[PDB]
Design an enzyme around this catalytic site. Sequence first.
Site, PDB file in Angstrom:
ATOM      1  N   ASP A  80       0.809  -1.181  -0.167  1.00 14.00           N
ATOM      2  CA  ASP A  80       0.036   0.084   0.108  1.00 14.00           C
ATOM      3  C   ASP A  80       0.907   1.398   0.060  1.00 14.00           C
ATOM      4  OD1 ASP A  80       0.796   0.139   2.683  1.00 14.00           O
ATOM      5  OD2 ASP A  80      -1.205  -0.259   3.472  1.00 14.00           O
ATOM      6  N   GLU A  87       1.720  -6.238   6.680  1.00 16.41           N
ATOM      7  CA  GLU A  87       3.154  -5.572   6.359  1.00 16.41           C
ATOM      8  C   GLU A  87       3.887  -6.748   5.762  1.00 16.41           C
ATOM      9  OE1 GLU A  87       4.176  -2.614   7.090  1.00 16.41           O
ATOM     10  OE2 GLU A  87       2.228  -2.106   7.786  1.00 16.41           O
TER      11      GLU A  87
HETATM   12  C1  LIG Z   1      -3.953   5.543   4.975  1.00 24.00           C
HETATM   13  C2  LIG Z   1      -3.582   6.548   6.109  1.00 24.00           C
HETATM   14  C3  LIG Z   1      -2.888   6.689   7.007  1.00 24.00           C
HETATM   15  N1  LIG Z   1      -2.565   7.622   8.019  1.00 24.00           N
HETATM   16  C4  LIG Z   1      -1.436   7.317   9.083  1.00 24.00           C
HETATM   17  C5  LIG Z   1      -2.453   6.652  10.317  1.00 24.00           C
HETATM   18  C6  LIG Z   1      -1.396   5.400  10.872  1.00 24.00           C
HETATM   19  O1  LIG Z   1      -0.923   6.379  11.883  1.00 24.00           O
HETATM   20  P1  LIG Z   1       0.271   5.326  12.964  1.00 24.00           P
HETATM   21  O2  LIG Z   1       1.484   5.172  12.169  1.00 24.00           O
HETATM   22  O3  LIG Z   1       0.541   6.301  14.023  1.00 24.00           O
HETATM   23  O4  LIG Z   1      -0.389   3.984  13.190  1.00 24.00           O
HETATM   24  C7  LIG Z   1      -0.749   5.289   9.840  1.00 24.00           C
HETATM   25  C8  LIG Z   1      -0.821   3.874   9.090  1.00 24.00           C
HETATM   26  O5  LIG Z   1      -0.147   3.765   7.786  1.00 24.00           O
HETATM   27  P2  LIG Z   1       0.523   2.372   7.465  1.00 24.00           P
HETATM   28  O6  LIG Z   1      -0.555   1.391   7.589  1.00 24.00           O
HETATM   29  O7  LIG Z   1       1.305   2.596   6.559  1.00 24.00           O
HETATM   30  O8  LIG Z   1       1.544   1.900   8.994  1.00 24.00           O
HETATM   31  O9  LIG Z   1      -0.741   6.097   8.897  1.00 24.00           O
HETATM   32  C9  LIG Z   1      -3.034   8.731   7.846  1.00 24.00           C
HETATM   33  O10 LIG Z   1      -3.134   9.680   8.803  1.00 24.00           O
HETATM   34  N2  LIG Z   1      -4.000   8.899   6.919  1.00 24.00           N
HETATM   35  C10 LIG Z   1      -4.270   8.010   6.148  1.00 24.00           C
HETATM   36  O11 LIG Z   1      -5.155   8.172   5.075  1.00 24.00           O
HETATM   37 CA   LIG Z   2      -0.098  -1.300   5.943  1.00 26.33          CA
END
Ligand SMILES: Cc1cn([C@H]2C[C@H](OP(=O)(O)O)[C@@H](COP(=O)(O)O)O2)c(=O)[nH]c1=O
Ligand SMILES: [Ca+2]
Length: 129
Positions: free
Chosen positions: A15, A37
Site C-alpha cells: 500500500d 506488512e
Molecule cells: C492511510 C492513512 C494513514 N494515516 C496514518 C495513520 C496511521 O498512523 P500510525 O503510524 O500512528 O499508526 C498510519 C498507518 O499507515 P501504515 O498502514 O502505512 O502503517 O498512517 C493517515 O494519517 N491517513 C491515511 O489516510
Molecule cells: Ca499497511
Amino acid sequence: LHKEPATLIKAIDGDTAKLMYKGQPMTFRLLLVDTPEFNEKYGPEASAFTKKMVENAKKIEVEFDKGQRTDKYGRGLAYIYADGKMVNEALVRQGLAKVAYVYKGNNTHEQLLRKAEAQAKKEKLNIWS
Ligand SMILES: Cc1cn([C@H]2C[C@H](OP(=O)(O)O)[C@@H](COP(=O)(O)O)O2)c(=O)[nH]c1=O
Ligand SMILES: [Ca+2]
C-alpha cells in the site's frame, strides 16, 4: 476528483510506492486501505500484486481526495491508477487489503471499496480465506 500524472520511481509494499509527482519524489500511501506488512501473512502477496500493477502500467496517475493530501509522515495520500484501474480497489477486490483508515473528508471512494471487499469476502479470497 481528478486524475493527475505521476511516474513510478520504485515499488515499496502493498500500500505504498515511491512516485514522481509534479517532478518531485514522494512516497505515496494508498487511501482507504491497509495491506499486511511484508513480514505478515499475505504481506508478500500484497507487495507483489501492487508491484506488478504499477511496474506494468504504461500510465500511472494519482487522484487526491477532497481533504489532507499528505499524512503526518509526509506521505502523499491518494488513489493510485494503473492504466486507468485503481490499485486501491484492485487490492481490496482480491482480498489483499482491508478497507481501513476511513477518515471524514477523504472518503470519496469508500462505498466502491466496501463493495469490492464484500465480494472478496464472499469468495473467501486471501485474507478472507
Ligand atoms: C492511510 C492513512 C494513514 N494515516 C496514518 C495513520 C496511521 O498512523 P500510525 O503510524 O500512528 O499508526 C498510519 C498507518 O499507515 P501504515 O498502514 O502505512 O502503517 O498512517 C493517515 O494519517 N491517513 C491515511 O489516510
Ligand atoms: Ca499497511
